[PDB]
Amino acid sequence: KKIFKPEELRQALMPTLEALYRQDPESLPFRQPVDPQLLGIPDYFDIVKNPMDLSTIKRKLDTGQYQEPWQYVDDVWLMFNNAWLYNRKTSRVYKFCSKLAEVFEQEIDPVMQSLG
């Protein structure tokens, strides 16, 4: 049973998160937690029960909250699923989410092979 050290996870997985941050404009809606009052979308927390964003994932990596790589992947996918659930298919946020999911799939695969 492989035990992953926090710095091993940070060194392997942080570059995949940085690849999402580097997408501009597509990462802009995801860099900070959704603020429904500021954005004028007060129904947000009625629809999205478990919010997630890039800055929260980065903090979890920096503070050793993930014991296994799949837990990090689950949080990235939670962020994507929240955006596809909440936003309309024609919206900027939905299409930007779809682009981030393509980028993430490409970056995470070789990294998971290396962590095996």
Ligand X SMILES: CCOc1ccc(C(C)=O)cc1-c1cccc(N2CCCC(F)(F)C2)c1
Instruction: List interacting residues with ligand X (CB under 6 A).
Output: 25, 28-30, 34, 39, 41, 83, 86-87, 92-93
The amino acid present at 95, given as its one-letter code, is K
Instruction: Indicate the residue among 93 and 115 with the shorter CB distance to ligand X.
Output: 93
Q: SS3 sequence, 73-88?
A: HHHHHHHHHHHHHHCC
**Nearest residue (CB) to ligand X, 8 versus 28:** 28
Q: Residue for token digits 């603020």?
A: 35
Min separation Cβ 28 and ligand X, Å: 4
Task: Give the nearest distance from C-beta 26 to ligand X in angstroms.
Answer: 8
Question: Residues 102, 19: contact at Cβ < 8 Å?
Answer: no
Q: Which residue is nearest to ligand X (CB)?
A: 29
Alpha carbon distance 16, 90 (integer Å) = 27
Does the N-terminal peptide bond of residue 6 adopt cis geometry, omega within 30 degrees of 0?
no
Q: Which is nearer to ligand X, 16 or 87 (CB)?
A: 87
The helix or strand, by DSSP H or E, that contains position 52, with its residue range, turns out to be: none
Smallest distance, ligand X to C-beta of residue 112, A: 25
Q: How far is the CB of 107 from ligand X (least distance, A)?
A: 20
CB closer to ligand X, 12 vs 34:
34
